[PDB]
Amino acid sequence: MKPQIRNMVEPMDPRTFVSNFNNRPILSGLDTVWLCCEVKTKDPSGPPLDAKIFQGKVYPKAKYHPEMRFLRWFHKWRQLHHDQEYKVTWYVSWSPCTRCANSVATFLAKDPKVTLTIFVARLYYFWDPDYQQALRILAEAGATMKIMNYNEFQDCWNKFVDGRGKPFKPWNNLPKHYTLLQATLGELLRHLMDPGTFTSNFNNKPWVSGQHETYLCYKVERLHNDTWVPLNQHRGFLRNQAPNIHGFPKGRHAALCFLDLIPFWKLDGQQYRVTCFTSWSPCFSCAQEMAKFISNNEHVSLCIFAARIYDDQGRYQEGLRTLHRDGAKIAMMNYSEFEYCWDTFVDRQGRPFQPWDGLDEHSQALSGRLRAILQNQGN
Amino acid sequence: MKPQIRNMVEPMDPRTFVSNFNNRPILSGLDTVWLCCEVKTKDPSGPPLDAKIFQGKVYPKAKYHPEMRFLRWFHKWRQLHHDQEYKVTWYVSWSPCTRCANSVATFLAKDPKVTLTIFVARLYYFWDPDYQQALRILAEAGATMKIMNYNEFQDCWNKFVDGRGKPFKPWNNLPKHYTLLQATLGELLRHLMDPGTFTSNFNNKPWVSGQHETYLCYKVERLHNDTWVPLNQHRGFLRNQAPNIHGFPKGRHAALCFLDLIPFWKLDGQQYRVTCFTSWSPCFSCAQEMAKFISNNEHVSLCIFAARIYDDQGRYQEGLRTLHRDGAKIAMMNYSEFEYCWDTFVDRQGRPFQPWDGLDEHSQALSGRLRAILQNQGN
RNA sequence: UAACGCUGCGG
RNA sequence: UAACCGCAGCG
Ligand SMILES: [Zn+2]
Ligand SMILES: [Zn+2]
Ligand SMILES: [Zn+2]
Ligand SMILES: [Zn+2]
């Protein structure tokens, strides 16, 4: 063999990084794509082998796109290095196009020893059908598609930016932008839920659970002459964001993330039915925000199916009554809803829905509780 | 003499007004232009006669532009009312187009009894040559072109918005946007300065003034093979913004407004020489900001001609030395510069520059003072 | 900020 | 946020 010295990264200046890796989902003015690649081996506890920055205008003629430049460089690198399994990581500012995605899928087919992971700052044309198809080509060829969070921005700053020892300072709204982008990516990749996660979290057993977490599957329908027709695109599932110093410092409940996601869809003036299936009914704060949302969204009909009633140390009845008295339709999941969620949102791998013990009894009991809560008048 | 009832305006809801009248100079997403007109008689102590809101898409098929719809409405309105002098005021979200500007000029020529004043929220395509030509067509046909400030936004909110009694709440950065837009409008209409104002402010007599104030005329040239050639557009003059609760609460010195204006020009990577003529040499804070600006703009050469040395309660020498030691070229206006400013930026109305008594003597004295200030020792 | 630019046809 | 949209050729 012949030895190749590392090639210490020629870094980008801080202002270019701050401008080009701002993860505001809708951001105009960026004409260049920046890609920061790093090649390691199977072992993550061994120092990286090589890191290189590529850039390029987003102009058609994908020949000069940074993904193609990386492909050329890394073919050379592979011919010059030991033949073993390698793990490439990308920090790319925009999501790739169809042409580059097909080239990458082809290369991964040719070189099955390379595992590629892509962290994107922003999703590029996530509403355009063909860029969604590009993301699917990539995910299908093996690559792991992810959104850059605070940790990946910090690491990119450390490894690829001319910070001069100064620490990475995050911008305003980095967690909210990350939440929106992660949800949209889950939609575009049609990400399905872990079977065990589903059974553990959606079990309508009254309280017997672990530490409280809320899972929310969502789907959209549109009105067409007194019958609802599905919208296959805006469907998926999310969970509550736990408190995080560099995320949401006090957390974000599932319902709040969901109400954040709805306006990002940029729906029409037509009537939409947004249905969700939550393992816990909304808390009081969630209920207040959903009431305000319904109060201010004429064309949106909220259907809430809870698997359990969350008792928020007292406020649950009042919150449920406000939510019922302000617009939302609220039901408790019976068998049919659990089976539909298992079929639609769960990575069932072909296995049918196994009903946990006592499902129908628990569903009827929860229905009775909800009926008593709603019909308990005040004055 | 058949009577016409006023026609109480059907107001726009606060959502639409807040979105469409935000005065961020570069604002995408607004496809409609909203225009709120009000007709008075030639008397501010008499209640307005009529007020009407028009709206319309911004693109061609100019028939449906709100400017044309107002023209049609107001021709009829004139045919139905007493023939006298009228004062029309517009609050329009975007500056008008060439077709509408020509129609308005035509109407103003046909109907000389109408005086039209236009307050624009944002300048529409202020870099496109033809929209600037439209602004010039309007100003020359008689119309008074202005930018909406806080008072005009509050007035629009009261007279045309469904505020429901709530007071007008201003958005973030309204004064800064106003300054950018006011300077750009003065450039596009090539507004010249009052002769008396020039003589009063640029007199290089040492201190003898009133509650004095700093005026800054500015010009840009660009380099082409060892000779500087003019840029006729980015030339004009501004003054310091006095403290204002609804403007800059503490004020904005002329030099700071100028350094704010420079990046709005969106200059190139080519070398530009930006020359200014200020009635007062920069204060200490101005000097610090200009030093940092030069520190971060490689391609911009600042040439400062001061008519007087401002004695900033002690710190003027250190400020001037910092400005000199950080990039800026500093001179005192001799006769030639005063006459050039009189010719270029002053509404001289044809008459030549009359040099005030003792000009050359004062210029020599100020030049000597500046030379002594710059050539003072360090350690 | 629905997100590279120029040149055009139309709505 | 250089700022209505679709279609079409090129950088
Ligand atoms: Zn590409
Ligand atoms: Zn909650
Ligand atoms: Zn028009
Ligand atoms: Zn100052």
Numbering used by the authors:
A (entry chain A), B (entry chain B): 1 to 142, 147 to 383
The authors write:
Human APOBEC3G (hA3G) is a member of apolipoprotein B mRNA editing enzyme catalytic polypeptide like (APOBEC) family, and is one of the most effective antiviral host restriction factors against exogenous retroviral pathogens such as human immunodeficiency virus type 1 (HIV-1) and endogenous retroviral derived remnants on the human genome. hA3G is a DNA/RNA cytidine deaminase converting 3′ target cytidine (C) in 5′-CC-3′ or 5′-CCC-3′ motif to uridine (U) within single-stranded DNA (ssDNA)9–15 or single-stranded RNA (ssRNA). hA3G has two cytidine deaminase domains in tandem, the N-terminal CD1 (or NTD) and C-terminal CD2 (or CTD). The ability to bind nucleic acids and form oligomerization is attributed mainly to CD1/NTD (referred to as CD1 hereafter), while deaminase activity is performed by CD2/CTD (referred to as CD2 hereafter). In this study, we describe four structures of a soluble primate rA3G variant from rhesus macaque, rA3GR8/E259A, in complex with AA and GA dinucleotide-containing RNA molecules in the form of ssRNA and dsRNA with 5′- or 3′-overhangs.
Additionally, RNA1-AA was modified to 5′ U1U2A3A4-dsRNA8-C13C14U15U16U17U18 with 5′ and 3′ overhangs on both strands (designated as RNA1-AAxtal, with dsRNA8 5′-CGCUGCGG-3′/5′-CCGCAGCG-3′). Complexes with RNA1-AAxtal and RNA2-AAxtal were determined as two different types of dimers with two rA3G molecules binding to one RNA molecule at 2.90 and 3.10 Å, respectively. In both cases, the electron density maps of RNA were of sufficient quality to allow de novo building of a complete dsRNA8 plus three nucleotides (3-nt) on each AA dinucleotide-containing overhang (5′-U2A3A4-dsRNA8-3′ and 5′-dsRNA8-A9A10U11-3′). In both dimer models, there are no direct contacts between the two rA3GR8/E259A monomers, which is reminiscent of A3H-dsRNA complexes showing RNA-assisted dimer formation. Averaged RNA surface area buried with one rA3GR8/E259A is ~820 Å2 in RNA1-AAxtal and ~841 Å2 in RNA2-AAxtal. With two rA3GR8/E259A monomers contacting one RNA, approximately 1640 to 1680 Å2 of the RNA surface area centered around the AA dinucleotides was buried in a rA3G-RNA dimer, which accounts for roughly 28% of the total RNA surface area, leaving most of the dsRNA surface exposed. In the 5′-overhang dsRNA co-crystal structure, dsRNA8 has little contact with rA3G, resulting in a relatively weaker electron density for part of the dsRNA. A C-G base pair (C5-G12) 3′ to the bound AA core (5′-A3A4-3′) is hovering over the surface of CD1-loop 3 (58VYP60). The side chain of the loop 3 residue Y59 shows no clear electron density at 1 sigma contour level, suggesting it doesn’t make strong contact with the RNA. When in complex with 5′- or 3′-overhang dsRNA containing unpaired AA dinucleotide, RNA-mediated rA3G dimers are formed.
